Amino acid sequence: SLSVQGTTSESASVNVQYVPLTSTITATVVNQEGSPLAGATVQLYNTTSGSNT
Amino acid sequence: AVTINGITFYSPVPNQTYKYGQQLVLSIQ
Amino acid sequence: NVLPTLTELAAGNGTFTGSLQFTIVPNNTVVQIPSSLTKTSFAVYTNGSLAIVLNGKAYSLGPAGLFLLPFVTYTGSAIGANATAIITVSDGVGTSTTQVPITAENFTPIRLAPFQVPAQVPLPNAPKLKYEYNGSIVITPQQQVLKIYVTSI
């Protein structure tokens, strides 16, 4: 808000914004048949925490 | 520039998005 | 030469004058002013676009807002000659969208002045958009009077 209180009580309502920061990691599986596998479980551990969180 | 409620905003004009470590500077006439 | 060149009137009079004639081009730059303070929301352009009348015609000098004076301050907001107000008025039946072009044939010289200062004498030695009233006005809940003069000459 700019409540510019000079000579004028000017009331502005300037919106601003912020986008959060999220990361997205992808993993892929292929074999010797050259066909992408479905049903494979892949587990991401965050190993920058000093354990397998 | 744009007259929102009396303040000739050169910056901010409404719905202005910011980034991590970005400096808002208040430029107003 | 369509503007003067500076010459003297008599032998060593020491005089240098010219002459500049002005106008405004009506602008169209659509500036919607968001107001959630009152239901009526109001779009006032950038207050004409000042120009110089040379050769009979307008050649722009840019935003006439910061140029010219005065302008009414709808909570600060500069509304003066050469605009359009697109109006969204409300009522118990709903709303209607009206439009009023803001002309300088709609300029309207009105001061609003205190109860204790004369209505038709303005104040140029008090600030243009402000004067501090020093008089006491007591409010009473059935007689809540905010006394002023809306001088409508």
For chain C, how big is the Rg over CA atoms in Å? 22
Q: What element of type H or E holds C87?
A: strand C83-91
- Cα-flanking dihedrals φ and ψ of residue C40, to 5°? -65, 120
Experimental method: cryo-EM
Name the E strands within B1-29.
2-4, 7-11, 27-28
Name the E strands within A1-53.
2-5, 9-12
Closest by CA to C73, choosing from A15, B26, B8, B10, is B8
Burial (CB count <10 Å: 0-12, 13-18, 19+), residue A9:
middle
User: Cα(C102)–Cα(C107) distance, rounded to whole angstroms?
Assistant: 8
User: Cα(C39)–Cα(B10) distance, rounded to whole angstroms?
Assistant: 26
CB contact (8 A) between residue A15 and residue B15: yes
Name the E strands within A6-51.
9-12
User: Cα(A50)–Cα(A46) distance, rounded to whole angstroms?
Assistant: 9
Residue with tokens 């208040």: B26
Q: Report the length, in residues, of chain C.
A: 153
Q: What is the resolution of this structure in A?
A: 11.2
Question: Which chain B residues touch A4 with a CB distance below 8 Å?
Answer: 6-7, 28
CB contact (8 A) between residue B4 and residue C66: no
User: Cα(C27)–Cα(B7) distance, rounded to whole angstroms?
Assistant: 19
Question: Which chain A residues touch C36 with a CB distance below 8 Å?
Answer: 13
Q: Does A8 touch chain C (CB under 8 A)?
A: yes
